[PDB]
Amino acid sequence: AKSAANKLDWAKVISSLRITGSTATQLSSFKKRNDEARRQLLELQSQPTEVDFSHY
């Protein structure tokens, strides 16, 4: 559902062409992409966080 948010983000990039020199709004998009990429690799990296009592 975040794809609509990022569609709105690129709409705001092509409208932020009207304001060149955004100091930290593009950095805010940078930070949200950074920790979004961090959390998606964190949840894909995550196992069922347990020790297998049956086998292991």
């Binding site: 955004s22 100091t23 930290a24 709004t25 950095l27 805010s28």
Partner: protein, 85 residues
Amino acid sequence: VSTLIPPKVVSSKNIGSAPNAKRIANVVHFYKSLPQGPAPAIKANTRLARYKAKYFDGDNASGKPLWHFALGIIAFGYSMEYYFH
């Protein structure tokens, strides 16, 4: 550190820039301008004004009334000849 915000700071920006001064000049320049040649006062008479309106506008603009004025001096000084010599 957070979502920074210059998309909407237009409300107090619109004084200092150069098209603002031109804009506040020419919105004042446009309203009192008469639309389509109105109130030109094309008819006027003050016992000498039809002479001006027929002769001394930019349409005709010919110096021949000065000729008539020269003729007036030919009416004047030659008659002063009749008064002097």
